[PDB]
């Protein structure tokens, strides 16, 4: 049948092939980790932007055709990580998928999705230097190789007073520390890093109490999180995976349902649909990857 062109980039590269009116997303899935070598699977997914312009994750059961894709020539998707380890040191094996999650990180630090203080900035972004330029060369790099680098986050160039040129130094310093650090080193380091900020790894979404107050639902490797609407940073209230028997919604209101009793159980409301669903996925994915880095 009629082929229908897809382009699908990963955080470093860009695949376009042809596919047909009855391929699935996940024969679709499969080619693009089979073409770039990438076994670990489960942390990934594809997403798109549906006819409406907005952010959707494709299912690998369905056809690509009978979900949304807005229509264009090629079909766009972004082969982005979903999922992230409890402990990228330990669990990441590959190192394709090493340097994709160090990518996609790196882009939501540096994008001011994830907050980071000033200090721990110049520290990871001292690490993405090693990672690409290499050792550290006074010849080469003279005064003004990282000129051109786009190296610490907007929103904290905003809160602390220092010249493009004044950072690029502060960086310069922590760069020639790392001697010899072999590039794949330099990423799993920054990710290291990138692991403890408070933001790290989560999926945060508007949500109302039942006594009506905004508040943030924040979904994660570990667990669930809630969060008071002026602060990402620190949780009001934990659910780990662990403490947490069934999570479900019915419409709009969702309830989490434990392990021990006690808890009164908590209840939440979200707006749109559309939001809610993805919601369910991110727990489900989330609550699964959980139990089996602790089989039996």
Same mark, same amino acid.
């Given at each position: 049948?009629? *082929?229908?062109?897809?382009?699908?980039?990963?955080?470093?590269?860009?695949?376009?092939?042809?596919?047909? *009116?009855?391929?699935?997303?996940?024969?679709?899935?499969?080619?693009?980790?089979?073409?770039?070598?990438? #076994?670990?699977?489960?942390?990934?997914? $594809?997403?798109?932007?549906?006819?409406?312009?907005?952010?959707?994750?494709?299912?690998? +059961?369905?056809?690509?055709?009978?979900?949304?894709?807005?229509?264009?020539? *090629?079909?766009? =998707?972004? =082969?982005?990580?979903?999922?992230?380890?409890?402990?990228?040191?330990?669990?990441?094996?590959?190192?394709?998928?090493?340097? $994709? =999650? =160090?990518?996609?990180?790196?882009?939501?630090?540096?994008?001011?999705?994830? %907050?980071?203080?000033?200090?721990?900035?110049? $520290?990871?972004?001292?690490? /993405?230097?090693?990672?690409?330029?290499?050792?550290?060369?006074?010849?080469?790099?003279?005064?003004? %190789?990282?000129?051109?680098?786009? @190296?610490?986050?907007?929103?904290? !160039?905003?809160?602390?007073?220092?010249?493009?040129?004044?950072?690029?130094?502060?960086?310069?310093?922590?760069?020639?520390?790392?001697?010899? !650090?072999?590039?794949?080193?330099?990423?799993?380091?920054?990710?290291?890093?990138?692991?403890?900020?408070? !933001? %790290?790894?989560?999926?945060?979404?508007?949500?109302?109490?039942?006594?009506?107050?905004? @508040?943030?639902?924040?979904?994660? /490797?570990?667990?669930?999180?809630?969060?008071?609407? +002026?602060?990402?940073?620190?949780?009001?209230?934990?659910?780990?995976?662990?403490?947490?028997?069934?999570?479900?919604?019915?419409?709009?209101?969702?309830?989490?349902?434990?392990? +021990?009793?006690? /808890?009164?159980?908590?209840?939440?409301?979200?707006? #749109?649909?559309?939001?809610?669903?993805?919601? $369910?996925?991110?727990?489900?994915?989330?609550?699964?990857?959980?139990?089996?880095?602790?089989?039996?």
């Amino acid at each position: 049948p009629k *082929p229908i062109n897809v382009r699908v980039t990963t955080m470093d590269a860009e695949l376009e092939f042809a596919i047909q *009116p009855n391929t699935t997303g996940k024969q679709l899935f499969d080619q693009v980790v089979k073409t770039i070598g990438l #076994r670990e699977v489960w942390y990934f997914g $594809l997403h798109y932007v549906d006819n409406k312009g907005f952010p959707t994750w494709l299912k690998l +059961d369905k056809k690509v055709s009978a979900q949304e894709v807005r229509k264009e020539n *090629p079909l766009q =998707f972004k =082969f982005r990580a979903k999922f992230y380890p409890e402990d990228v040191a330990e669990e990441l094996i590959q190192d394709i998928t090493q340097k $994709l =999650f =160090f990518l996609q990180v790196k882009e939501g630090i540096l994008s001011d999705e994830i %907050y980071c203080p000033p200090e721990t900035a110049v $520290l990871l972004g001292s690490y /993405a230097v090693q990672a690409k330029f290499g050792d550290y060369n006074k010849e080469v790099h003279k005064s003004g %190789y990282l000129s051109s680098e786009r @190296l610490i986050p907007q929103r904290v !160039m905003d809160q602390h007073k220092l010249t493009r040129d004044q950072w690029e130094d502060r960086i310069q310093v922590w760069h020639a520390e790392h001697r010899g !650090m072999l590039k794949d080193n330099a990423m799993l380091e920054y990710l290291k890093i990138a692991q403890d900020l408070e !933001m %790290y790894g989560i999926n945060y979404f508007e949500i109302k109490n039942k006594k009506g107050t905004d @508040l943030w639902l924040g979904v994660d /490797a570990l667990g669930l999180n809630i969060y008071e609407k +002026d602060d990402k940073l620190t949780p009001k209230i934990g659910f780990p995976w662990s403490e947490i028997r069934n999570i479900s919604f019915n419409d709009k209101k969702f309830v989490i349902k434990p392990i +021990d009793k006690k /808890a009164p159980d908590f209840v939440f409301y979200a707006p #749109r649909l559309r939001i809610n669903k993805r919601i $369910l996925q991110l727990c489900m994915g989330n609550h699964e990857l959980y139990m089996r880095r602790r089989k039996p």
